[PDB]
């Protein structure tokens, strides 16, 4: 944490869109919005970063696929 919380990572969608299979990650519901348990985010993030670093050091290629509106620029800049 201490970076995730300020970045608004732990903000989900309303109760009108949540996929039931995602329920294992949700901490609690506030003011009609779904909040993600940042702790589980921490362990999962550690796991995924470990995998990413291992694959990169092995020389593997990772493809970035984000085609939303706002995500275009960030994806381009990061991938380049």
């Amino acid at each position: 944490v201490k970076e995730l919380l300020e970045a608004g990572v732990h903000f989900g969608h309303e109760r009108k869109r949540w996929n039931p299979k995602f329920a294992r990650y949700i901490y609690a519901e506030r003011n009609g919005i779904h909040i993600i348990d940042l702790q589980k985010t921490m362990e999962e993030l550690e796991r995924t970063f470990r995998f990413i670093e291992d694959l990169a050091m092995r020389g593997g290629t990772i493809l970035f696929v984000g085609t939303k509106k706002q995500a275009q620029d960030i994806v381009r800049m990061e991938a380049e």
């Binding site: 732990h10 996929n19 995602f22 990650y25 348990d37 985010t41 970063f49 990169a56 990772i62």
Partner: protein, 55 residues
């Protein structure tokens, strides 16, 4: 479509999934935000930095 294509060819999947997603289709998952430019920025910057450093 991308995720289904990656599944079909036995390619690992990493996603920045949020509340309205199915975690099963993703092998390595980051439960966080997909809106909120700041969240995307943090996650992607960290990942790219880790890529660069561990080369």
């Amino acid at each position: 479509i991308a995720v289904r294509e990656a599944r079909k060819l036995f390619i690992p999947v990493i996603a920045l999934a949020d509340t309205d997603s199915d975690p099963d289709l993703v092998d390595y998952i980051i439960p966080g935000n997909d809106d909120a430019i700041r969240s995307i920025q943090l996650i992607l910057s960290r990942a790219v930095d880790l890529i660069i450093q561990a080369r």
